[PDB]
Amino acid sequence: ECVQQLLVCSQEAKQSAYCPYSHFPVGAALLTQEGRIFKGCNIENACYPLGICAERTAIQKAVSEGYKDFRAIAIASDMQDDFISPCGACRQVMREFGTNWPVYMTKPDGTYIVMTVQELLPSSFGPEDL
Amino acid sequence: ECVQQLLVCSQEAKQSAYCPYSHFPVGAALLTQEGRIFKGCNIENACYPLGICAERTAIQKAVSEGYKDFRAIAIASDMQDDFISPCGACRQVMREFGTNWPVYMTKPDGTYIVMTVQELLPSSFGPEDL
Amino acid sequence: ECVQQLLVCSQEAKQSAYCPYSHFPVGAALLTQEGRIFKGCNIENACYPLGICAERTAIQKAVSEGYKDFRAIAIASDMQDDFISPCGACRQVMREFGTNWPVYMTKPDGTYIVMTVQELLPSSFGPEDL
Amino acid sequence: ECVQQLLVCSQEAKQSAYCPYSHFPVGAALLTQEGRIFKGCNIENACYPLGICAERTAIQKAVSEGYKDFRAIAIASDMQDDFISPCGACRQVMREFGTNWPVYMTKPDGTYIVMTVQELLPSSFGPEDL
Ligand SMILES: O=C1NCC=CCN1[C@@H]1O[C@H](CO)[C@@H](O)[C@H]1O
Numbered sequence: 066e067c068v069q070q071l072l073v074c075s076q077e078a079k080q081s082a083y084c085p086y087s088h089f090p091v092g093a094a095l096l097t098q099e100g101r102i103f104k105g106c107n108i109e110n111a112c113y114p115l116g117i118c119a120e121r122t123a124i125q126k127a128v129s130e131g132y133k134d135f136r137a138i139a140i141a142s143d144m145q146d147d148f149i150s151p152c153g154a155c156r157q158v159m160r161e162f163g164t165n166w167p168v169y170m171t172k173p174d175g176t177y178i179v180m181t182v183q184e185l186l187p188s189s190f191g192p193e194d195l
Numbered sequence: 196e197c198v199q200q201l202l203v204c205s206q207e208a209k210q211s212a213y214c215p216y217s218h219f220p221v222g223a224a225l226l227t228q229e230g231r232i233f234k235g236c237n238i239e240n241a242c243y244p245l246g247i248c249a250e251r252t253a254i255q256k257a258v259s260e261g262y263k264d265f266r267a268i269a270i271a272s273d274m275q276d277d278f279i280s281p282c283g284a285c286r287q288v289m290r291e292f293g294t295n296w297p298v299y300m301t302k303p304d305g306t307y308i309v310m311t312v313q314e315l316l317p318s319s320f321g322p323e324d325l
Numbered sequence: 326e327c328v329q330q331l332l333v334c335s336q337e338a339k340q341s342a343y344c345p346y347s348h349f350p351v352g353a354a355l356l357t358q359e360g361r362i363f364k365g366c367n368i369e370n371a372c373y374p375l376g377i378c379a380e381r382t383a384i385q386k387a388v389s390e391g392y393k394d395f396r397a398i399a400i401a402s403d404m405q406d407d408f409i410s411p412c413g414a415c416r417q418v419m420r421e422f423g424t425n426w427p428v429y430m431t432k433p434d435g436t437y438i439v440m441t442v443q444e445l446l447p448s449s450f451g452p453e454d455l
Numbered sequence: 456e457c458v459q460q461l462l463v464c465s466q467e468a469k470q471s472a473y474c475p476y477s478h479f480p481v482g483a484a485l486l487t488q489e490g491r492i493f494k495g496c497n498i499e500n501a502c503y504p505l506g507i508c509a510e511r512t513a514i515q516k517a518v519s520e521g522y523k524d525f526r527a528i529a530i531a532s533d534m535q536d537d538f539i540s541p542c543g544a545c546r547q548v549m550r551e552f553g554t555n556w557p558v559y560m561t562k563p564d565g566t567y568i569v570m571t572v573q574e575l576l577p578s579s580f581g582p583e584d585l
């Protein structure tokens with residue numbers, strides 16, 4: 066039941082969210098095999114397209130530290146009627162570093178649904194096709 | 196058996212591909228409900244991130260023409276041992292305009308596997324969560 | 326080939342804008358050497374990072390159609406105070422296909438200011454750097 | 456706070472670069488007002504459009520950590536002929552957090568050229584335009 070640890074960490078991360086345009090804060094906490102946890106939030110830009118997601122910010126922070134072996138990730142948002150699910154782009158970056166690790170799509174209260182990168186990105190495009 | 200029509204159109208589209216960096220040409224042919232077909236290819240940039248996929252180029256061309264109701268899309272590449280599958284990002288743009296339409300992931304010879312946007316992007320993030 | 330054409334064409338292009346999130350419509354009119362014009366608009370996505378600008382939509386349309394020349398491009402917005410300037414990303418895609426050509430930053434007023442791709446993105450990163 | 460620190464720190468950052476596709480490593484060292492430095496590298500993806508630059512990786516790391524100030528940033532590459540300049544997209548993300556601060560474009564030589572965010576992206580699009 067260490068999932069609990071991640072969830073709180075992703076809600077903490079959500080606090081540093083820079084989303085002045087959508088006002089839709091998002092946080093994520095990435096867990097490596099080593100046991101270290103990397104936090105990330107969405108970072109928008111006046112030119113919407115140049116923004117970045119919370120999952121991407123965590124993965125990129127971890128990869129820049131040398132951690133490329135992930136065990137799981139938890140996403141948090143202020144949405145109530147829906148679990149917070151990663152977008153196609155984020156699912157593609159996750160895929161770059163793993164196919165069988167769990168993604169925790171939470172709700173503000175602590176409830177969540179879990180799916181692996183493969184389940185989220187079936188018949189995925191990947192490194193091997195290049 | 197009009198799928199044939201799309202496939203050829205996506206291979207035609209693949210010819211205008213501007214991929215000097217990956218040398219990995221990709222074409223796509225989008226079919227609207229009206230029956231019109233929109234072609235697209237990947238367009239790279241020295242700064243890799245600024246590039247764009249073939250599916251995205253077709254959808255964006257169609258949307259800029261007022262077509263937002265899609266019936267199907269076909270992707271073509273020069274890859275042999277794998278069907279050409281859309282990346283997470285492209286699956287997210289498709290989702291923006293439809294959840295139940297077919298995506299034709301072809302092979303150079305004409306063989307292919309088909310899946311809907313939903314199957315490709317399960318538990319998807321979408322407009323409604325905003 | 327002529328300014329007026331670009332002013333009205335980029336203005337019409339703005340009409341197809343798919344921007345339910347920003348409510349900030351943008352249009353683009355890319356004039357090729359041949360004399361053909363390509364219209365483009367901003368096309369947003371529920372996941373902000375996956376939207377795309379009017380200029381890129383226009384350029385991508387052109388390239389996918391075989392045109393990589395470009396004599397000029399005009400941008401338009403519903404912004405009455407100040408001319409819409411392209412975002413750094415667009416300047417970067419513009420540069421991939423030339424650094425001298427003009428970019429017409431306009432106002433609904435019909436009034437405009439013009440700057441070359443090179444002036445918009447000085448000491449730029451490009452294909453030569455490989 | 457000091458040039459030398461940024462030159463070596465951006466150089467180390469380049470070591471974590473995940474660039475199996477371009478084989479073009481890039482490092483970034485963002486100096487915050489506080490005096491803390493954030494390293495970043497380019498992190499590519501099988502789908503080129505989904506990679507991310509060293510500067511954005513560095514900036515995003517910082518912001519997610521609460522820092523939105525920035526006193527300067529240095530870029531580094533294995534490019535011995537010419538200083539690496541940031542791509543338009545990076546300049547655009549840089550601008551979102553200030554337009555005056557310096558950008559140190561370097562050479563493995565230790566030699567460099569410096570230009571402000573504003574000089575790199577003149578007559579820029581920004582948050583004020585909403
Ligand atoms: O970080 C995200 N992760 C989860 C789900 C959707 C996309 N987002 C962010 O939500 C905002 C609305 O698109 C924008 O800041 C995205 O980066």
Ligand SMILES: O=C1NCC=CCN1[C@@H]1O[C@H](CO)[C@@H](O)[C@H]1O
Nearest residue numbers: 217221237247248249501502503
């Ligand atoms: O258009 C694509 N569609 C299908 C599958 C993967 C991603 N690509 C392109 O393949 C190249 C390698 O990433 C790059 O130009 C992408 O835009």
Ligand SMILES: O=C1NCC=CCN1[C@@H]1O[C@H](CO)[C@@H](O)[C@H]1O
Nearest residue numbers: 111112113347351367377378379
């Ligand atoms: O097309 C654009 N071109 C010029 C100027 C700004 C960036 N945009 C669009 O404006 C909206 C605000 O970021 C978003 O839909 C962008 O695609």
Ligand SMILES: O=C1NCC=CCN1[C@@H]1O[C@H](CO)[C@@H](O)[C@H]1O
Nearest residue numbers: 241242243477481497507508509
């Ligand atoms: O990090 C970068 N910063 C500065 C200069 C160019 C763009 N890049 C990276 O160089 C590679 C070539 O486009 C790709 O991995 C980009 O992310």
Ligand SMILES: [Zn+2]
Nearest residue numbers: 118152154155
């Ligand atoms: Zn995402």
Ligand SMILES: [Zn+2]
Nearest residue numbers: 248282284285
């Ligand atoms: Zn794609």
Ligand SMILES: [Zn+2]
Nearest residue numbers: 378411412415
């Ligand atoms: Zn733009």
Ligand SMILES: [Zn+2]
Nearest residue numbers: 508541542545
């Ligand atoms: Zn960059």
